[PDB]
Design a binder for this molecule. Structure first.
Ligand code: AG
Ligand code: AG
Ligand code: AG
Ligand code: AG
Ligand code: NI
Ligand code: NI
Ligand code: NI
Ligand code: NI
Ligand code: O
Ligand code: O
Lengths: 570, 122, 100, 570, 100, 100
């Protein structure tokens, strides 16, 4: 008996060779392989396969290769591949990617993916499943920002702040032992993974290091605290000792140095360059040249992503409002014109497409949008396909190569940069079960369900008084993973090895899962999945034109984007 | 170039289910006065006692239908179905408690079926 | 007023419908949430009028047509579901394929 | 001096012989007796009776027969009676039903109902007071469902789920030790009593029993997991050992058996039959015959309650949406026609009225309405009075007999079925102070105040910025019982004896009151208060007509209900 | 805008009033929460107009009559209370027995 | 509808704008939150219409004049900022000194 490929895809989701459109973009992903055994597909419901003695095993106790949760028939989109599999979760981690069910009667069952008495089922047939997004440029300004992040598929927030204090409103900084302790306690109530950055400023080691020992997961060097040679040098000396990452927003004003001075202070040590294009901050006009260096892990923030007809007008005024600039102070106008540059914003689109900028991030509530990292990644990929054509690496008319290059920018690459990819950032066996289900029609726009540590934390779901959950109004809502003590077991606080060794979690009474930051001094650009290109980036100081391999990088701004007015009420 | 957000472009061809397993056609009759619907993955010998068929021909088998679908028998309805072989370890536990081990133990399965009044033990 | 949770939520649907209707009146092609809001509020106001579930299952397929909405919106809406108080208590209305 | 009966009832609430209309129904309750001493009624306010040296005792410390809380002048509606009393609460439990005040100067004071320095006062004059509702068919899908339940007077949620996972969206199941532990932790944050059901599926004892040992309060057998003879048998063997209840949603498809096969597997052991009418699930078409058996504790879910002109059109389409049925697959149409039956829905109204179906429940967010169990109980009673007339048992032109039969369906009977009636389900001395105040005009529609463990958890109250609390907007709001650590002391997590003996609460850090499930293997239909009828229910397999004592049970659907468009904004 | 909690809540009353007025305009007899919403919003908009508490205590008894509302609604509403910002700050208005 | 947090919040701005416009239509001088609500909703509805950021920066300075608002309101509003979905995605509009 045979099923045509349209009916097969309707029932079980797509299989090998089938393509799926990403929302209302021009981007097509193709199923590369499928772990199923055709006819033994797992499914749940009335008269379906996952029933006792059938696709559900009735013999094995939970410890005996039985799952706590099976996602059936998932279309995985990950740096590791675009492929069809069941996903098995146990003790809050991904334990099996393959074929779930009952070895009693089914062929091809992955041995540790038994559906048993202990197993919950999520139907992923017809869904795209990705890793949770890893946002490494978060300002903690307003707790309302967390649901905004969850609604667009973000599961980890790395950054800093104490709420809407001016220090926090400009910089990803939780400064000093006391502010760090207070925000680790606050974190107990936030339904998302968190890591806190200390102030990467000082001329003595001790004031900087004591933040790492207090429970910071990294440092932020910001020009608003003095992005001087000394603050850069001391921060990186601390980071090399403590095994944590340093993020930098460099000296835009070129007050104590130009870019070459900042690179000399770094002295070949690993650093994460934030908003590397420079509208969000950095050496005017040539900061984006950072992204060519082997020791630099370069991220964009999201408002420049991608280059549109309203970008420049919006950014010139945003910078006026953010910096309190006056239109009748010539030095303010000159500063703004030196910082907001169509030449570097247009080049930023192409550097993303070429794998020269490795990461996306938000700059949430300081100069960026908490719920638009995933959204603007795909809008950029779609613009680049329209303006540059399929990449040479593509086959079968699919955009799989571009889809793996771009999904890496907000999943695995930030995780690697931060020293947390042992826990999060990809759908791989042994990693924490932070998973986002998307309807293809809503892909990258509005998440269906966000799984945190193997329990749903956030869902687009309807009327709580209704007979069924699908009636209006369908909106983003916190789910049982956020409630009571379950918020502790489904979320990770990432901390320095030293703060963990010194017992800070017990001292502060932290109940959340504790994640260890490690292995982020030994990495470089080569470690950025699908985004590992080093090259000489030339930025003309007079014209701001960007050149790579002697070729000017330029593209036009677009009048319209997908993943925009078809979807949003405002 | 009309865009249907999230639409499929499925490849050419057909998906063969249960490829390479033996197929068997049998006649089955609902002798009861209420409808019986049978799922794709129930050990076929263990269905409702009031379905009359050659019970031996249901041992080690299930319906050769797409995963998660069912065959329906209205009251008094007789029709043919196609069976495929169980796979994996070819063991069944629970359901109607007729097997609880290897599907190879045909005589033991049929003795329990007959004693409990599963129609059609020949 | 003694508002319960559902009454407080469902006020939001009426509001989104009022917003969408103003956008349609100034000649915009409506988007996905606009279209859903208009048809949902229609159903809830129909229940309040004392229409039957059967009448609203029919009427809901003629509130908006494809020339009222953006490209792809018809195909994005498989159905619209709403629960409202009919003269005979709360009932569920599902309008299948409301826009062609 | 004498007071006429109109002024008396206005000042103190009604007294013996006085009748009260239930909302806008035709149902009248009559005060059967009054514990007061006329002239010594308790009341609180300026120049009122509960003042030091007067109706308040100024001598006794809290331990010396003094109450923490007195509800003055309550009209109790309970399986135990419809009567006027003061209700005294201490240490979160009902300690006295009688006459409160000061034995110094008042006649007839119940000895442990002293109003003292330690005593808070709630005025219940002109209110109806009931037990909190016990909903035993809850799907834990969306935490927003809890306020919906509180707003219609529900105080206990028994069921299962992990949030909007497909397993939980179809079945009242929290599967396996890990999911159960995670949801017991979630429960710490839910302002309502909770008991969790495990998966009642397997062919070996250990996979089922380990859920009871992990902290489940019972099991659910659901056809979506395989409602086979084996899963039924193993679940009941576990339940008989563990002293917990089993709920069943039987094999609608008759795949492995007909009703007589399911009854043989049960083998005379106690079981709770969910949605016994069968629109919500079960052997087509004759599941409702379960409700005639002595070992079956039968509940309805609420969308069929009662039979209205929109019921069938609504249910046929609801089942199409819920099951993903296609109108052009004849087997889907046949299935739907075999399951949604006016004959069994009409009979269900009369079986309720006759005391043959013992319980109501919601089926919250799976196939039923979280906030309409109480609402639809009274709509059914009102329809039955209109179509069948006063029951023969009635006296004085009151509906007291019918009011006790119907209030039992959502208070005491579910509590007895679940093994929790030692703690909850009625207004009796020694039970937990879960109490709902109703204005008669809003009775069964919108609760005034919901008391949980002797503290108000939920109230219809107005503008929080106002001089007084009655200005608009008046809406359902969480009260201080829900806030901080008080959510732990005012709510009960119900658990198996074995999980309690094995120290699960301390292992998981549960701070909630722990309730023990017990005495639910030794009971049957005879134990269902006012709803204890066993009889041969015949369901014709060709016509679906229902007969009891040779008589066809049929009634018409109604075009209008009370407790509907007069009250609801949508 | 600097909205405080009461300003955010009281927007809901205006919305419920707008919904109720649309239901009255298409010829429905109004129910309990509709009637309360209309009279409440009247009071709050009256305060904003700079009417006195005394004027609104009188006017609120003539916004809806028994032929505007369902059977029993007049007798369900003992009074309607609202606090609003008058030219002389927040004051409480109670309209007693607003519908006969 | 799939409303996200910002969509749910921004419905409130449209509502406050509708309330303020009704107050202006019956001849009231508008106060601070009314004025902000009207100009904010104008910007968000402009984005929905497909105007540019540059057009709304100009138009927003002519929605209300000093004779529409109470004494001191012009000088209380330094600027009005709103983010909305333009055809090219979310952008920030700031209207500087909207009322003189
Ligand atoms: Ag800025
Ligand atoms: Ag700035
Ligand atoms: Ag259903
Ligand atoms: Ag269903
Ligand atoms: Ni920066
Ligand atoms: Ni920043
Ligand atoms: Ni059920
Ligand atoms: Ni259910
Ligand atoms: O930034
Ligand atoms: O159910």
């Amino acid at each position: 008996m045979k099923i045509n490929r349209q009916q097969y895809a309707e029932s079980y989701g797509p299989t090998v060779g089938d393509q799926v459109r990403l929302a209302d973009t021009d981007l097509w992903i193709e199923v590369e392989k499928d772990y199923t055994t055709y006819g033994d597909e797992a499914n749940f419901g009335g008269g379906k396969v996952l029933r006792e003695g059938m696709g559900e095993n009735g013999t094995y106790t939970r410890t005996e290769n039985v799952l706590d949760l099976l996602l059936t028939n998932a279309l995985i989109l990950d740096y590791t591949g675009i492929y069809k599999a069941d996903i098995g979760v146990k003790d809050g981690y991904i334990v099996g990617i393959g074929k779930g069910g009952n070895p009693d009667i089914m062929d091809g069952v992955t041995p540790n993916m038994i559906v048993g008495t202990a197993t919950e089922v999520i139907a992923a047939e017809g869904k795209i499943v990705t890793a949770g997004g890893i946002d490494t440029h978060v300002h903690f300004i307003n707790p309302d920002q967390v649901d905004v992040a969850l609604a667009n598929g973000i599961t980890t927030l790395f950054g800093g702040g104490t709420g809407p204090a001016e220090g926090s409103k400009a910089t990803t900084v939780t400064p000093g032992p006391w502010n760090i302790e207070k925000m680790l306690k606050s974190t107990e109530g936030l339904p998302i993974n968190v890591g806190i950055l200390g102030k990467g400023h000082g001329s003595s080691i001790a004031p900087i290091m004591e933040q790492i020992d207090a429970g910071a997961a990294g440092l932020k060097i910001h020009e608003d605290w003095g992005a001087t040679p000394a603050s850069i040098d001391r921060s990186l000396t601390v980071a090399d000792e403590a095994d944590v990452q340093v993020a930098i927003h460099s000296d835009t004003l070129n007050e104590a140095g130009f870019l070459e001075d900042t690179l000399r202070a770094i002295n070949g040590r690993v650093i994460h360059s934030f908003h590397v294009e420079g509208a969000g901050g950095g050496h005017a006009p040539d900061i984006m040249a950072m992204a060519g260096h082997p020791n630099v892990l370069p991220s964009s923030t999201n408002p420049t992503r991608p280059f549109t007809v309203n970008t420049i007008d919006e950014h010139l005024d945003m910078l006026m409002v953010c910096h309190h600039l006056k239109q009748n102070i010539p030095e303010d106008v000159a500063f703004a014109d030196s910082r907001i540059r169509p030449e570097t914003i247009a080049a930023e689109d192409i550097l993303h497409d070429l794998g020269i900028i490795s990461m996306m991030s938000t700059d949430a509530l300081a100069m960026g949008r908490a719920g638009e990292m995933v959204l603007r990644t795909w809008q950029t990929a779609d613009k680049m396909k329209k303006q540059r054509g399929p990449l040479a690496e593509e086959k079968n008319g699919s955009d799989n190569f571009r889809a793996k290059r771009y999904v890496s920018k907000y999943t695995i690459n930030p995780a690697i940069a931060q020293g947390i990819a042992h826990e999060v950032g990809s759908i791989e066996e042994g990693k924490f079960a932070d998973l986002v289900l998307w309807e293809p029609k809503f892909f990258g726009v509005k998440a269906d369900r966000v799984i945190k540590g193997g329990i749903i934390a956030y869902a687009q779901i309807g009327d709580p008084s209704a007979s069924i959950p699908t009636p209006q109004p369908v909106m983003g809502r916190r789910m049982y993973g956020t409630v009571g003590d379950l918020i502790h077991d489904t979320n990770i606080t990432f901390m320095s090895k030293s703060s963990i060794q010194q017992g800070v979690p017990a001292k502060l009474g932290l109940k959340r899962r504790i994640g260890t930051v490690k292995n982020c001094r030994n990495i470089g650009k080569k470690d950025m999945k699908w985004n590992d290109v080093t090259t000489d980036i030339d930025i003309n100081p007079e014209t701001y034109e960007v050149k790579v391999d002697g070729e000017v990088l330029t593209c036009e701004p677009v009048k319209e984007l997908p993943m925009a007015q078809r979807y949003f009420l405002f | 170039n009309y865009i249907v957000p999230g639409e499929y472009r499925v490849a050419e061809g057909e998906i063969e289910i249960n490829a390479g397993r033996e197929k068997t056609t049998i006649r089955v009759s609902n002798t009861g006065d209420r409808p019986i619907q049978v799922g794709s993955h129930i050990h076929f010998v263990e269905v409702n006692k009031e379905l009359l068929f050659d019970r031996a021909e249901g041992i080690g088998r299930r319906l050769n239908i797409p995963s998660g679908t069912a065959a329906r028998f209205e009251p008094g309805e007789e029709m043919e179905v196609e069976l495929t072989e169980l796979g994996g370890n070819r063991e069944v536990f629970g359901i109607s408690d007729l097997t609880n081990g290897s599907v190879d133990n045909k005589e033991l399965i049929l003795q329990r079926a007959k004693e409990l009044g599963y129609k059609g033990v020949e | 007023m003694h508002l319960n949770p559902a009454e407080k939520e469902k006020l939001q649907i009426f509001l989104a419908s009022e917003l969408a209707l103003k956008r349609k009146a100034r000649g915009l092609k409506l988007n996905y949430p606009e279209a859903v809001a208009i048809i949902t509020s229609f159903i809830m106001e129909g229940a309040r009028d004392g229409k039957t579930v059967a009448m609203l299952m029919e009427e809901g397929k003629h509130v908006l047509t494809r020339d009222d909405v953006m490209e792809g919106v018809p195909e994005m809406i498989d159905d619209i579901q709403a629960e409202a108080t009919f003269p005979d208590g709360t009932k569920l209305v599902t309008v299948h394929n409301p826009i062609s």
